[PDB]
Design a protein around this ligand. Structure first.
Ligand SMILES: [Mg+2]
Ligand SMILES: [Mg+2]
Ligand SMILES: [Mg+2]
Ligand SMILES: [Mg+2]
Ligand SMILES: [Mg+2]
Ligand SMILES: [Mg+2]
Ligand SMILES: [Mg+2]
Ligand SMILES: [Mg+2]
Ligand SMILES: [Mg+2]
Ligand SMILES: [Mg+2]
Ligand SMILES: [Mg+2]
Ligand SMILES: [Mg+2]
Ligand SMILES: [Mg+2]
Ligand SMILES: [Mg+2]
Ligand SMILES: [Mg+2]
Ligand SMILES: [Mg+2]
Ligand SMILES: [Mg+2]
Ligand SMILES: [Mg+2]
Ligand SMILES: [Mg+2]
Ligand SMILES: [Mg+2]
Ligand SMILES: [Mg+2]
Ligand SMILES: [Mg+2]
Ligand SMILES: [Mg+2]
Lengths: 117, 154, 70
RNA sequence: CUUGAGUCUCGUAGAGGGGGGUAGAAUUCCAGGUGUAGCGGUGAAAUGCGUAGAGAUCUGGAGGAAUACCGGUGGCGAAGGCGGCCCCCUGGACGAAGACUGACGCUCAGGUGCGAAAGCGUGGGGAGCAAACAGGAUUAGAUACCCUGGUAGUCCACGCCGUAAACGAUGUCGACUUGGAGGUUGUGCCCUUGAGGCGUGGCUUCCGGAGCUAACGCGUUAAGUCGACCGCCUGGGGAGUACGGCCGCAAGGUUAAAACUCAAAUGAAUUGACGGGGGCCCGCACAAGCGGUGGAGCAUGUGGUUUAAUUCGAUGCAACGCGA
């Protein structure tokens, strides 16, 4: 029911999946969408196209809120990391700032062991 | 082939209507090198179709082709050890050829008695967009849509 | 890799700057390397291999590739 | 006596060691807000988590471990090893000029100390990871690889253990023998005219001459030419095993045989072949297409069975309408 005009698009782009989440500038989430829910599984949801349609879906979902400006915070190494932002722009927000917030540790916790494939 | 960009071969246009496309259709239809028979069948089908549907033989034929050509087909790209069905835009010469092939196969299947009759019925159906060749095209498109995620990552 | 789209900057252009900034930062490379635990011995060995290969290649190009190829 | 060896003076660089604080990023968990059906994972799945509201996102809190960038064939250390920042204690190396002692040196069986990781004892701690273990896949099976979990352990204190491909697979000390390109850290002169010119020490990387080597290669940091001392080897297996001794809480470590058995076992390089190596390329090899065979009847050849005989031969492609 409310209007905000200016949101943040948090694009969590892991290798398996892309989660797009539109939020108010404060942190409160408005709508979200994933390639999984967008209708892609496995090899198909780990692709740029899936991310794009997820982004489109998210934009549609938050259409009620009437969001006009949008800053995008990209996280993780992902097949989308670009498709989502392109899709969002096409869906027709003014992209104001694009920021990378991928969490790199300063040599912290030990990663899991290497896969033998 | 590996090392060949061979020149496309010369097809003569059919005598009745002077059309290369029609000639190609006749060739596809033909069996056992029996061209005369194929041309007779094609002409009979065209004449019936023109009478039933309208304008000319060539215009009716074109309409059917338009409703049965595929924009996109799928190939199997096998790079990551597994095979990805990738969509791919089908070039115009192939579009005509594939459509013609589909139409002839559908006609062969069809239950009407004479070949000419089957062909005429199939063509008319294609024109309307409720036949089997058209169904085949639809299936091809459906597959392409399904595998659209693998379109521009070959 | 923070970017702010300037006044009258096209979107494609903005995207280009963002990608360049990320590449310069080296975020993707860092994440990929930190995906799994490389053993210290493995890290040392890889470093040694990289150093050897780089040196050998440079020497080969500059000094060995000063002859008539045809 | 002063050239080896050491002392003193002044500086230098350093993840050298011990102790105590602290910082930020990130993971985990906890509480709360927003919010809604997915998340997670894989080659593809499932187990797992989520409508009891997860994942995502913002705030706050707890706690443990490790210190991104700098970061380097860089540095330090006898080796093992050492990596945020700050302080306290502390060892060594190097250069400069002198001054001092006056062979005080080198090596070392026994002996003594130090000695990664795993492991052990006692007491803490426990985020992440993860032997064992559990479930899901894969598979002929899969007590594995992959996935989701996960306990010892990894961390701290103090003891033990005492071994590693603990490797430069190269014992320590000293002298001598053509070069080139670097890195690092001192120092003398040159106006530093600029980041710069010419020297002279230390450590260090690569290339290469003579010489050496079975060859590969080593080559002023030698595997070259020599001297001192030590350690060790004498065919493969049996076997670094048994017995005995010593050490250890244990796991085990260390010292260390014999019978019996074979005529080889090995090192380096060469030519092939092969690779679920790599690069380049071709062929109805695939792909794109068209028509068949495999089902039916019959012809024909073969296997088999049968027969008195069913003549003999061909029998993966490259025998089977073949000799015929
Ligand atoms: Mg994983
Ligand atoms: Mg220091
Ligand atoms: Mg030193
Ligand atoms: Mg001894
Ligand atoms: Mg330990
Ligand atoms: Mg313990
Ligand atoms: Mg304990
Ligand atoms: Mg785990
Ligand atoms: Mg596991
Ligand atoms: Mg040993
Ligand atoms: Mg070592
Ligand atoms: Mg040894
Ligand atoms: Mg000694
Ligand atoms: Mg050399
Ligand atoms: Mg013997
Ligand atoms: Mg023993
Ligand atoms: Mg014993
Ligand atoms: Mg084929
Ligand atoms: Mg048959
Ligand atoms: Mg049969
Ligand atoms: Mg046979
Ligand atoms: Mg015979
Ligand atoms: Mg025979």
């Amino acid at each position: 029911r409310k209007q905000v005009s200016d949101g943040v698009a948090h694009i969590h782009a892991s290798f398996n999946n892309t989660i797009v989440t539109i939020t108010d500038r404060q942190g409160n989430a408005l709508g979200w969408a994933t390639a999984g829910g967008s209708g892609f599984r496995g090899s198909r949801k780990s692709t740029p196209f899936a991310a794009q349609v997820a982004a489109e879906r998210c934009a549609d979902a938050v259409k009620e809120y009437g969001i006009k400006n949008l800053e995008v915070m990209v996280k993780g190494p992902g097949p989308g990391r670009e498709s989502t932002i392109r899709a969002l722009n096409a869906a027709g927000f003014r992209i104001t700032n694009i920021t990378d917030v991928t969490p790199i540790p300063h040599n912290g916790c030990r990663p899991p062991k290497k896969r033998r494939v | 082939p590996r090392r060949r960009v061979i020149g496309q071969r010369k097809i003569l246009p059919d005598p009745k209507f002077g059309s290369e496309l029609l000639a190609k259709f006749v060739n596809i239809l033909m069996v056992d090198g029996k061209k005369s028979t194929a041309e007779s069948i094609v002409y009979s089908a065209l004449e019936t179709l023109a009478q039933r549907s309208g304008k000319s033989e060539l215009e009716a034929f074109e309409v059917a082709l338009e409703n049965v050509r595929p924009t996109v087909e799928v190939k199997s790209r096998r790079v990551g050890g597994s095979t990805y069905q990738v969509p791919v835009e089908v070039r115009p010469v192939r579009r005509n050829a594939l459509a013609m092939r589909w139409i002839v196969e559908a006609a062969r299947k069809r239950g009407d008695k004479s070949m000419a009759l089957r062909l005429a019925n199939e063509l008319s159906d294609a024109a309307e967009n409720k036949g089997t060749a058209v169904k085949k095209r639809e299936d091809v498109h459906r597959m392409a849509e399904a595998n659209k995620a693998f379109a521009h990552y070959r | 890799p923070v970017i702010k789209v300037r006044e009258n900057e096209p979107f494609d252009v903005a995207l280009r700057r963002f990608k360049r900034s990320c590449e310069k930062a080296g975020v993707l490379a860092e994440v990929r390397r930190r995906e799994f635990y490389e053993k210290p011995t493995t890290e040392r060995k890889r470093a040694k291999a990289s150093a050897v290969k780089r040196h050998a290649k440079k020497l080969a190009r500059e000094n060995a590739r000063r002859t008539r190829l045809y």
